[PDB]
Symmetry: D2
Subunit: 498 residues, 4 copies
């Protein structure tokens, strides 16, 4: 991309207008990846809690208190949430840094984007109730009414908790839906806080609900309950496929965003220093734990050697440390299990014949030994047939492959199971545009890397997802169309004998 | 709601008419007399895979996907004209294979011409949007591209009609497609492919597979090269398909029928309601996704309504679809007729009453066909299987309701949400009811109307997505956000 | 449906509060007692020209026109909040200057907040379109840009309300503007400018001219640097403006009032119709573009309706707008009251009957103000001037109609086409009538509703274009088609 | 960018379903500019004829036969017209060439575009009846119905008669309007023919009407009659202003397209031969009698001398002649009066201090002496303050001015009273895009000149017009919005005493 509060922060779930503990009183300790110290303890909900929230969401939806409220008034409420976000910008960002480990700077930028997401949707709320159709049948009035889709379950990941949450909550509330959200069990702090803020705004009982807990325990209820009309999920491909299959039991709509293997295509006529700078940004922000990370670098052969050296020299200078310290450029990874997964990819890489040009291990420096740190890494001498190139590592790691021609870059970039995002660096804009038109990706950046905003749809082709978040299209996931046809001059058909 | 001597018996793959890779065939039957009328290839899963790979290749070549939207529109329109041109033969073919009346079949052909024409005209009307970017010195745009390779599976009730709903938008947007009609009714689909071949499409753009869903079905829904799986049929096959599609996180569009309510208030135009109740339950022997199998009638007029409906149902004329006096043809197959017969047993076992019908007719000219008497089931309630489940036959149930609020609760008390009607002279009341029914389409004082200009699809278990209308075309498109930074500067986040 | 001691008395040009170039002033009056309440600058045509030139300069500088749509939205929203924040004072100010009741004024402020908020939210929602080009190797796009420099002229009936309708979209799209409220009611407009200054806009983006339309009006409509002239007022001034605008082929948006029919069928809710007939004719002493001055009542109930309406009109409470018991305030000025009085003479001379009212009230507390009695004119027809012309006072005419078809012909028999209502419990009939009325807005069983989410404007002589809604914003945008040939080749048409 | 059809072509007006002569039997001889010979004679209508057509249009609109027909069926009729155009492509093109003088190749292309304009609109007909609004007032239904604007008058010019006619007729018929059209008095042949074709398709009596005659006699009736809802005109600025002032008498909607002073901006990094080629195309197709002609060439100083010499050398080779001869590259101007207007501009140019680098006179070659020919011309050493640069000559003439920087090109290009179209020639696409974004023009071409099609709106900023033709926006000129608000739970306000 780009503490006082814990003593007052709620430790519970929010169900049917009440802050409640888990039905079995279980809890979970939340950790700070910088030092692996327990920073807070929260309720660990049960599947019956999730079910009660879903039933409450349904009841609240049928009561019409929110679903039948005027679109304009719903817009005002979503805007009020937007303002509470900005008002508590400092605390929310610190809280997100404490829980996820990324730098405060990155966190401030997230809060800025979150305010804008809510504000964008607040404004879109009353802008489109459907259409009037010119009917082909005389004496009939035809219209398409857009209604809230209904009860929606929302599941978010640990990399950008509040950000991913806003992308779902904003349109759900703007359209009039009822929702049940469950953040990642290892990072629920800002989500808990946003619910407290939403409660201050005021929503009819049951409209919004927060479940806390392991996906392995409550996850299936949220994706397969018959009272759910839409399941929206952002996370890994395996969990996504599972969710979809479970959702199929009730033919429930699904919206998924599953990360990718994002190419960063650098041509020999690119602005060289810019490309190096953006290659670093693409691979190492949030220790590369970004759905849109540019893990797969494609560089034109004529400048590959020059590029590799320049990138490697820079990677050695990346400053690791605590997210609260101003000099920090890269924080730690999210957990022990994720760090181990990354370490295993290093083994797979070497076993396949690739070269760990730099990094590929844990840093030894004293202030970093207690945290979940992993050195920024560059993997060279690799090709498309390797797992390290085809699979999403989701860590501070990037691979470099060379390409000869424009056509080869395109084939290589498109040679993956994914299709989320990517970039093309070239001073020849005409060439960049031809390439962008041929990349099978939801978002293509020309001479930039990471830009994304509420005004435009985000999502993936192929295995990177189904549907879109953000933009008008993102709002549409939360609506359903109904065709009401009125025959103004009804006559008997008299087909059947009388 | 003859040509056989010249009709192809093969599959159409990568620009060529070919037999199954294993030379297997299948006899096609006419439900009026259960006689074999034609024999066609019974494809293999390797044939389906070859068609998908050809679709992918044709899509990457850009011959169709990069053709101008306007020129694609002209081709879709040419198909529209060939449909109208061969209207007679197509309708006879559809009647011979499905058993519905010829009149119903002509109406289908008229709608099919209009579906293609509609999409032909929409083709060049929307390439995307220009976005006002929140980041200075950037240009933001959303380009709408053909979704890619698409697989299309259709049912046996309205084969060509359901096929047009998928083929038209797929071709209008620039996609490549592989279609597979119901194994028991592929005649008109084979014919439409022959017509499309006359129009002329780049090799691999269009492909036709013939065969059992149980043999080639899984490849069409789970192959990695497919970007969208569009299916119309039953709920069980639909759920299976969706699960299979999830293996590659493939988009799915599904339309699965329903338990459509026909709500009749005491202030409805009485004769109109009886007439439309018949139309809702018995067209195509009730083998319609939109059939009004579930009748909800206000208590004050339930007795008057039941008697009037029952008396009419006894007069329904059954017979051959080619005979002009025929009002209702036979059901589609032995298995489907048996399923219906079993529902009659379930109904009685649950305590419902078979007011009329509920059996096979024994009139000489009907004994050789797959006929089943139009039926009315009374004294039932929402807890019964006969009311909750889609029988998809010439059968309807009747339940009473006291108030406006009860009609709504009862109508919405099912797992489905496809379509329904409200009959009342009080339009204001009809509109309040329509706004509360969880259905994709609601008719006020009518039953069955549907057209290319408006989206058709279901809430809840009746489907995912929509067919027809602009929204139907959108299933065939995919959005791409291209963001250009016009004044690129180094971020300088990482040390140098 | 106090602050004066701190309120500015000057014009706002190019980021500065300034006096008229000739130091001339104008006394503003309170129509309740005709006392001078304030004095403001009376600008010159050179002042207007300087404001237009400053608007152009600011537009070319790009400080506002190239700002992100999102940030522009935030600014428009901040204005919306200042409106709500100063709701009490703005409403009192509007009542003091225009004479309408304080309750009517609070409602205006609530609508004004919503107009701005609406537009604030629409700001970043549509930058244009991507077109699927019919020419291979080309990219086609339509970019929506701010139309440019805009002049805005508002009337005296609802000054701030009419001002918001123009200012909001102009600022949301990135335009520069020069506004001039009615010379007799500029108080809330001056206040809104003070509030906009607090929000902060680049120098020259917003400008306020004060003065007689006869002196500065022509400059605002015929200057070559203006891209759009938006006006709300009377038909004669409107036509003049349009002709003047034609000198530079400048876009015009006009809203000119009307002769709004209020159609009441014999199956309408009788007490509701009487109630709405009163509301339609007498809010703001009928000085509303949307006033229902022309009542069309079905013959069968005409006598019953006339007596019921007349009896009510006699009970209408006139008085000071600040007094809670007031139902109707005074008319706006001497000249306007005189224009109304002259219509009474024309009415009688034509053969119509002044059933009630038609004069100034004598009661002591009303003698010092510009009061005029609510009036009902009967026994008239479509050929009369009193029926064809907009009186714009607390006056209504009553005509009878026999059938649905006659109501439609009579309603449409005028040079206007702004708004109207149909009162009938038979909604189906109300809808048929609404579809045939040549009016920009048609209410079914209501009178006056209007809101930012929907376009407002007139057919025929009631105007050109629309205000409010997406369409209202579009008056402030201009389309540019940018076509890039990605594979340029020489045509070689001309010899080498 | 018809010897024997004349024997069967109608010579009359088409009013209220009948081919009729002028009420006063007056006629007009139509001329072929190649040799100035009379080729045909047609009725010269009266103002009472125009009024009768307008009243018939109104009557037909109120009857609902066309305005209440299904949008789909209206689409089919417009499509039928499209097919008749293609069917009679050969004869129409010959007819257009015979009447206007442009080459037969240019005419075939027009017919191809005309088929596409009708087809485009045929397809758009049933695609948008309005919208459903989410009302801020509870218990109300809000909808916007898009209806045909009503009775429309349409006036076209002599340069591309059928083409300009299609742009108006197509959307008018697709939306359900009634229309009265009047082509240029000196070129009515293809318009008469299209009416004959429309009659074969079949439209309710009065829906379509054709008036023939001088603008000075029937023009005012068509722009100031009270029964007209829209006046659509394409032509010169002076007539346009007159029309608008007349339309104001009834506050009638106006759509105007008035030509321009279109810049053709050529940077030093443009593809040089391409720019020379397109500069020729921009200034000399149809003898430069095109609203979109690139009469004003802006060339970067560094290459001005090279460009001028290269353009001049080419202009001398332009082949003038009969439009029916395949070797013809440029035909004659439209009439004596127009040729004279051009000649006068040459005088003005020299008097102002400009140089007639080449051309600037009538050609003497034997086969051209009998026609209305005028040599392709290049005017150099001029500036923005001159009339020859500020005014639309509308002939085979172009001026050349130099610019130093990107910013100067923009200021110069924008320094006119017009704003219709223009081009930017540069291999640096990024620069071309910056320029395009700043030109106050309705259409900007990057590395091309003239492209225009039904799918995109065409029209001008400033004095080049009001409104748009083509595209969805062009169709919208033919629609009017109506907000129908239904209160579903009406209550008495009780404001007034009881
Ligand atoms: N929505 C509708 O319009 C519709 C249509 C037909 C049947 N139905 C319902 O379904 C029941 C009977 O239908 P049916 O079973 O004959 O048809 P079905 O539901 O299986 O649909 C038929 C289509 O699906 C294909 N198919 C079968 N297995 C497949 C697989 N594993 N993968 C992919 N495709 C596969 C078939 O070859 C055929 O093309 C009825 O009880 C009725 O309620 C609904
Ligand atoms: Na005043
Ligand atoms: Na008008
Ligand atoms: Na001529």
């Amino acid at each position: 991309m780009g503490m006082e509060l814990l003593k007052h922060l709620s430790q519970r779930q929010y169900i049917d207008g009440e802050w409640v503990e888990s039905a079995n009183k279980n809890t979970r300790d939340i950790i700070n990846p910088y030092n692996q110290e327990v920073i807070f303890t929260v309720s660990e909900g049960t599947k019956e809690d999730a079910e009660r929230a879903i039933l409450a969401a349904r009841r609240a939806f049928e009561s019409g208190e929110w679903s039948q409220e005027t679109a304009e008034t719903r817009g005002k409420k979503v805007r009020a949430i937007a303002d509470k976000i900005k008002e508590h910008r400092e605390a929310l960002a610190r809280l997100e840094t404490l829980d996820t480990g990324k730098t405060l700077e990155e966190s401030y930028a997230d809060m800025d984007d979150i305010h804008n997401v809510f504000m964008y949707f607040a404004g879109l709320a009353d802008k489109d109730g459907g259409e009037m159709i010119d009917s082909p049948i005389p004496d009939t009035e035809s219209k398409i009414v857009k209604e809230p889709v209904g009860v929606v379950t929302q599941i978010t990941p640990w990399n950008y908790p509040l950000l991913q949450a806003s992308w779902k909550i904003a349109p759900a509330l703007a359209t009039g839906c009822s929702l049940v959200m469950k953040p990642s069990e290892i990072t629920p702090l800002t989500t808990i806080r946003v619910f407290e803020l939403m409660e201050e705004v005021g929503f009819p009982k049951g409209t919004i609900n927060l479940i806390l807990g392991a996906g392995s325990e409550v996850g299936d209820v949220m994706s397969g309950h018959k009272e759910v009309d839409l399941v929206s999920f952002t996370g890994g491909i395996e969990t996504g496929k599972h969710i979809m299959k479970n959702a199929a039991n009730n033919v429930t709509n699904i919206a998924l965003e599953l990360g990718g293997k994002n190419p960063n295509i650098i041509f020999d006529d690119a602005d060289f220093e810019l490309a190096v700078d953006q290659a670093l940004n693409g691979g190492y922000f949030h220790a590369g734990q970004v759905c849109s990370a540019g893990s797969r670098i494609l560089v034109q052969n004529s400048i590959k050697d020059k590029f590799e050296q320049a990138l490697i020299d820079r990677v050695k200078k990346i400053k690791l440390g605590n997210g609260f310290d101003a000099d920090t450029e890269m924080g730690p990874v999210i957990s022990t299990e994720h760090r181990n997964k990354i370490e295993s990819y290093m083994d797979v890489a070497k076993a396949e014949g690739a070269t760990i040009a730099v990094g590929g291990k844990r840093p030894d420096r004293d202030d970093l030994k207690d945290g979940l740190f992993f050195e920024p890494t560059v993997i060279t001498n690799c090709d498309t047939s390797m797992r390290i190139v085809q699979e999403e590592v989701f860590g501070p790691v990037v691979t470099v492959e060379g390409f000869e021609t424009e056509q080869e870059a395109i084939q290589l970039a498109n040679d993956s199971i994914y299709g989320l995002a990517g970039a093309v660096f070239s001073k020849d804009i005409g060439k960049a545009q031809r390439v962008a038109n041929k990349l099978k990706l939801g978002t293509v950046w020309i001479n930039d890397f990471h830009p994304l905003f509420a005004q435009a749809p985000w999502g993936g082709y192929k295995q990177s997802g189904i549907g879109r978040e953000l933009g008008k299209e993102g709002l549409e996931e939360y609506l359903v169309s109904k065709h009401i046809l009125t025959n103004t001059n009804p006559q008997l058909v008299n087909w059947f004998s009388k």
